[PDB]
UniProtKB/Swiss-Prot annotation:
Organism for this UniProt entry: Asticcacaulis excentricus (strain ATCC 15261 / DSM 4724 / KCTC 12464 / NCIMB 9791 / VKM B-1370 / CB 48)
Gene: AtxA3
Primary role: Shows weak antimicrobial activity against its phylogenetic relative Caulobacter crescentus. Does not show activity against other bacteria tested (E.coli, Vibrio sp, Burkhoderia thailandensis, and Salmonella newport).
Subcellular location: Cytoplasm; Secreted
Effect of Q14A: Decrease in cleavage by the isopeptidase AtxE2
PTM (free text): This lasso peptide is hydrolyzed to a linear form by the isopeptidase AtxE2, in vitro. The isopeptidase AtxE2 only recognizes the threaded form (but not the unthreaded form).
Residues in the signal sequence: none
Name of the protein: Astexin-3
Entry remark concerning the domains of this protein: Is composed of a ring composed by 9 residues, a 5 residue-loop (SVSGQ) and a C-terminal tail. The peptide is threaded when the C-terminal tail is inserted throught the isopeptide-bonded ring. The loop region serves as a recognition element for the isopeptidase AtxE2.
Amino acid sequence: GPTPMVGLDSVSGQYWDQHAPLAD
């Protein structure tokens, strides 16, 4: 994902994602 944190992406890219894993 699009963060600056180098590591795994739930979508794609060389850095982490910043998606929204909510709960209710």
